A paper describes a structure:
Pinoresinol/lariciresinol reductase (PLR), an NADPH-dependent reductase, converts pinoresinol to lariciresinol and subsequently to secoisolariciresinol. Here, we present crystal structures of IiPLR1 from Isatis indigotica and pinoresinol reductases (PrRs) [name] and AtPrR2 from [name], in the apo, substrate-bound and product-bound states. The crystal structures were captured in the apo, substrate-bound and/or product-bound forms. We found that, for all 16 structures we solved, each enzyme adopts a similar head-to-tail dimer conformation, strongly suggesting that each PLR/PrR functions as a homodimer, consistent with the literature that TpPLR1 exists as a dimeric entity in solution. Each structure contains a head-to-tail homodimer, and the catalytic pocket comprises structural elements from both monomers. β4 loop covers the top of the pocket, and residue 98 from the loop governs catalytic specificity.
Intriguingly, the β4 loop is well defined in the [name]_NAP structure but disordered in the [name]/2_apo structures. These structural differences suggest that the loops are somewhat flexible, and act as a switch to control the binding of NADPH and release of NADP+.
Residue numbers in the entry:
A (entry chain B), B (entry chain C): 9 to 90, 96 to 317
The structure:
Amino acid sequence: KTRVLVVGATGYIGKRIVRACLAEGHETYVLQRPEIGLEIEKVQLFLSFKKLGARIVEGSFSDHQSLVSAVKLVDVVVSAMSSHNILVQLKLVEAIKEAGNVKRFLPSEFGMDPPRMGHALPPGRETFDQKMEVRQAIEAAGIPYTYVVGACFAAYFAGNLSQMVTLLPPKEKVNIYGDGNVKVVFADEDDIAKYTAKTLNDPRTLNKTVNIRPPDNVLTQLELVQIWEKLTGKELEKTNIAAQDFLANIEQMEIPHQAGIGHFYHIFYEGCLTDHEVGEDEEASSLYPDVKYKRMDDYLRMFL
Amino acid sequence: KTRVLVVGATGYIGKRIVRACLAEGHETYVLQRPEIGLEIEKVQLFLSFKKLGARIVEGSFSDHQSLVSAVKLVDVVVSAMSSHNILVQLKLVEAIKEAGNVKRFLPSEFGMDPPRMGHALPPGRETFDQKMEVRQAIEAAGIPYTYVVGACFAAYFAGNLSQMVTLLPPKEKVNIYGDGNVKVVFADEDDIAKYTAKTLNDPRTLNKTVNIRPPDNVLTQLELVQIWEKLTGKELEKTNIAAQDFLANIEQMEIPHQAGIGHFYHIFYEGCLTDHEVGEDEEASSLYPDVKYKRMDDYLRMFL
């Protein structure tokens, strides 16, 4: 019981959500679009889904009632859209509204909490406003909701030691942002997918914002580096980077990777993932203690 | 106890060859070049090799010594490059020649036997030129070899029912090439990978061409369609497409769509994978009957 439709199942986090829902025990439906047809590694991905028991539902964002058709089948929709890919979610929102059977929607939120980013930095701000547009469509339709926020994906922030331009630990030299004493929240993407699978039929998170702040994984950038140093037995030579040398030459001197560099600043310089605090009734590791979340020392071991 | 380096592991057949080596029991080294510490799905491929026991080897084609080093850790280097990808092999073959320690090399050919392609014309021809340009460079260095040819990947030619323009079964209509009585070879790509992992170490094939031609998988597109409509229960509205109409106006289409049109013609009209016969000393399924390779029935069943 609890039939779940996943839209965005070809995305980085959406792979993981489908497999987390299958293993949690939901009836997991996966929307198939004119996806591939065209691209090989997304058919095989979908084939791998059905070999585990996912049910394929064809639909298009161009075809409004194909979307109503997907969502008639389930109790809960989960979106993981990783062009304007966040704002296409509004085509789905009114599909859910026309259908009316939906007991919950979880929009594509799996990073910084958007209503806390009112004075974010252009162009980075576009993300949070586009996501806030979708919330409003939801709440204006009276669609019950859950928003999963709070944690940097370990692959994009923890395995590269928070460097940019690489997704792997460095070989001798590492940049520290500011003094390196600002605390960031890291979470293995698998554990975000599992927390997502557990919260969607949980009565205690209906119409609420769930934070993913696993206590062992609340780290300053400098502690994270030290973890890597201890696994390896080698210090890295470290250059501290002052705030204004961090946004140096953003101007339009990089393609809108400018959005990423700005999100990085809010996290690593201002500490927006940690500048407030959350209760046990709204944080994921307290709500689902059965989930043994991968600590960042274990994440990093995968790279030795 | 056979050591194998796999170059091109991020590629389509590359992935499985890495995985088929490990399942057969060789010490499987995988070249990791700078290109991959980018694009998550390549780092997360590579660390899922690590979880399966592969050993990561760093190097660059632009650093001839780094390939020299890798090629010394190993008894056999396999290449599987799915443009520039075919003749960059040449600067590996020099790293293997200057090496001297490598008992077998397998260049990237898992398509059609190139010295039979004296008849195609540009632009389809070029990859055959490049493929034998790297063979002439292998036989010239005297590096012992094995070329592995003669099968359509089931994902590209079977599961789409040999329609171009998609990789999924057609919902109502199909195009039959010719009267559709030209029979070609279909191999599950997993099967092409495990064959290569077993002929790697085997004295029978050293310095010979081994053909992947499963007996029960030599079919024309017509019965392969009928296979699908057995499994499905519906008849597909066939439309035969005559050889001249199929290449009508090819010179006025984009010059990779030419290549694909030429490619499909050699297979489904000229019979390039059938125009020939092969015995048992030379045909993978007979040298390795411990494979219960997948027939296009069971393969196409994955889609229903």
